[PDB]
């Protein structure tokens, strides 16, 4: 374990914590077809 | 056949900068004979402000491009002549541009002569009419006052503009010096043409 190994890679500090972010108030699910919804609507 | 192309387009280049020839022309065979015998050919041109521009075309197998001492003495002897020199153009074969010693004499001569522009160029720069090439947009030097008016309207400094090297072929044919501004009229596939202004920076060699 070192201080400067926290930085470099995709799982590092810069790319995982600063350039991206874990967030609250978000949802995920499989998407599905529905022909009764308008193009600007989501079920 | 770089020599044949040079023999015509170097004089086309002298014409493009609005310079008056001093010595009458010689046939191409005589030019080749002088290049092989002496090791170089010299063309002297008169500028509007009475400056003198000397062009040295060096053979690819001459001594001045192999031994730095010969180039050193040639430059020293040509740079202490009773002439109102403003620029010497040293056209050498492209491999000579990578020869470090020759460039060292070039920069030493530059340091010893601060008010004389010393440039060393490859053959291909003068083997064609560069402005008439289709892929090259229309370059044009602009005055300092006009550039300052543009920059003042745009709230810009000369260091914010796009920059172009002084050894860029169209800039060389224009005679662009570092610190100058070149307006480029270029084709566009969105507006049918566009205008940019570039700030000329120091030559790469």
């Amino acid at each position: 374990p070192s201080i400067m190994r926290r930085l470099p890679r995709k799982e590092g500090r810069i790319r995982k914590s600063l350039l991206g972010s874990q967030v609250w108030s978000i949802s995920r699910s499989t998407i599905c077809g529905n022909s009764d919804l308008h193009l600007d609507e989501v079920g | 056949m770089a020599m044949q192309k040079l023999f015509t387009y170097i004089y086309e280049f002298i014409e493009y900068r609005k310079m008056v020839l001093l010595e009458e022309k010689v046939p191409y065979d005589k030019f080749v004979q002088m290049v092989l015998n002496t090791g170089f050919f010299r063309i002297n041109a008169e500028t509007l402000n009475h400056g003198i521009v000397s062009v040295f075309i060096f053979g690819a197998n001459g001594k001045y491009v192999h031994h730095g001492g010969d180039m050193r003495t040639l430059l020293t002897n040509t740079l202490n002549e009773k002439k109102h020199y403003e620029e010497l153009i040293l056209i050498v074969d492209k491999p000579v541009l990578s020869k470090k010693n020759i460039l060292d004499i070039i920069v030493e001569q530059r340091a010893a002569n601060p008010t004389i522009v010393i440039n060393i160029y490859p053959y291909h720069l003068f083997c064609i009419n560069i402005p008439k090439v289709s892929a090259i947009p229309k370059h044009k030097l602009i005055t300092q006052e006009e550039a300052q008016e543009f920059l003042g309207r745009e709230y810009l400094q000369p260091q914010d503009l796009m920059q172009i090297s002084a050894s860029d072929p169209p800039v060389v044919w224009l005679g662009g010096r570092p610190g100058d501004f070149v307006q480029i009229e270029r084709p566009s596939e969105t507006a049918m043409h566009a205008v940019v202004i570039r700030f000329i920076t120091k030559s790469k060699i």
Binding site: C32, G33, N34, S35 | -
Partner: protein
């Protein structure tokens, strides 16, 4: 499909036992060596309201209610102790510390929820 023939004797994680399986009407030689997994569903190749576009399908609700592709899905909970420190048992609110808020400790019997009861979110 029948993922294992000894499934009731196993405590496996994320395993699915589909109840009904059928041999294909058009089978292959591969079905002499492995059990087939699936059903001979009646399929209509048609446009029906636009709900099967872009690789979606429309399913009969009756086919679902009758057990088509239905099965039982299993999960595992393995919890370990610390020797002579931890123990299994129902905690008491008036002694123990940092109990999880909004948790249902009332379904436990001798530290374990009895077999056959329905556990929902927040139940211990």
């Amino acid at each position: 499909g029948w993922y294992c023939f000894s499934w009731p004797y196993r405590v496996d994680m994320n395993r699915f036992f589909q109840f009904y399986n059928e041999m294909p009407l058009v089978k292959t030689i591969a079905h002499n060596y492995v059990i087939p997994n699936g059903l001979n569903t009646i399929v209509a190749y048609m446009i029906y309201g636009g709900y099967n576009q872009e690789d979606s399908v429309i399913v009969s609700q009756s086919f679902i209610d009758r057990g088509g592709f239905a099965g039982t899905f299993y999960r595992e909970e393995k919890v370990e102790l610390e020797s002579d420190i931890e123990s299994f048992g129902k905690p008491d609110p008036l002694i123990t510390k940092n109990l999880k808020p909004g948790a249902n400790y009332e379904k436990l019997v001798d530290g374990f929820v009895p077999v056959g009861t329905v556990v929902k979110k927040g139940d211990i």
